[PDB]
Design a protein around this ligand. Structure first.
Ligand SMILES: Nc1ncnc2c1ncn2[C@@H]1O[C@H](C[C@@H](N)CC[C@H](N)C(=O)O)[C@@H](O)[C@H]1O
Ligand SMILES: [Zn+2]
Length: 261
């Protein structure tokens, strides 16, 4: 199965659906159907009835409908290396943007046992904490088990980072990634965005209010950022499809990112 088809169908693009048709034709020895037989994305495909499937493909619609129900009942397992890599791409993006937007002087990285900075080039004092630091990095990690009930009065300067570190309740000055609600009362959900400050370069147009780049100030995204935006969205979808969600301090404002230009 192609990588995108390992995502929940709600995330499949119009192109992913046509590759699903092609994969199923060979896996199940079906009569070839025209690639434009289901000209829609996965969100739309999930709204069709079985009768609609049968009308659009008299020779295989019912099989395809039932195949989709099986895919929907038993989601395909994901590849840890790809998922891990997708998460780390999102972590760098989000934390970089937060530091640029709000200029925190300190970052308190809670649950980081390897003392690795996800944004090594930011102008910020990086502090690491973990309940069980890796023995080869404990010399620069504070041994600490975070609980809101014990530490809510601490780490009040700068921002706190809880990247997949499940604690009882997150403090208000936090950036959080959680794997699957009272823990999040101090925060808000982080909606998708893409931010980049790399140089624009030319050589399908991208229309998106969430592409925060200099070239999108005027609505004419360059080829380079269009490509990087699509690659980033694929990584984001892989992480969200796998059960991760992102939460952020309530003052996080994407207009602070636009103002960097
Ligand atoms: N309440 C806690 N306080 C501090 N560290 C914790 C706590 N609970 C779990 N940990 C540590 O958090 C880490 C969780 C891991 N999933 C690693 C998360 C890490 N931020 C990452 O991006 O990979 C482990 O290293 C735990 O030792
Ligand atoms: Zn650009």
């Amino acid at each position: 199965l192609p990588a995108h088809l390992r995502l929940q169908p709600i995330y499949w693009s119009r192109d992913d659906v046509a590759q699903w048709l092609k994969w199923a034709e060979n896996e199940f020895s079906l009569r070839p159907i025209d690639s434009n037989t289901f000209e829609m994305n996965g969100k739309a495909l999930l709204l069709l009835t079985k009768e609609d499937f049968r009308y659009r493909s008299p020779h295989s619609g019912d099989e395809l409908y039932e195949l989709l129900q099986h895919i929907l009942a038993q989601p395909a397992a994901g590849d840890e290396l790809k998922i891990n890599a997708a998460c780390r791409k999102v972590q760098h993006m989000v934390v970089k943007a937060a530091l640029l937007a709000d200029k925190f002087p300190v970052l308190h990285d809670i649950g980081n046992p390897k003392a690795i900075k996800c944004v090594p080039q930011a102008d910020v004092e990086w502090k690491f904490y973990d309940a069980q630091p890796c023995s080869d990095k404990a010399y620069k990690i504070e041994e600490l088990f975070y609980s809101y009930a014990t530490h809510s009065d601490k780490f009040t300067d700068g921002v706190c980072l809880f990247w997949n570190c499940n604690v009882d309740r997150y403090p208000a000055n936090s950036i959080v990634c959680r794997f699957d609600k009272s823990a999040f009362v101090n925060l808000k959900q982080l909606p998708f965005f893409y931010y980049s400050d790399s140089p624009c370069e030319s050589h399908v147009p991208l229309k998106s209010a969430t592409c925060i780049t200099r070239c999108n100030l005027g609505g004419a995204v360059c080829r380079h950022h269009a490509n990087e935006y699509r690659l980033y969205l694929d990584a984001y979808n892989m992480m969200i499809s796998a059960g991760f969600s992102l939460w952020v301090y309530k003052q996080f404002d994407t207009y602070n990112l636009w103002n960097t230009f």
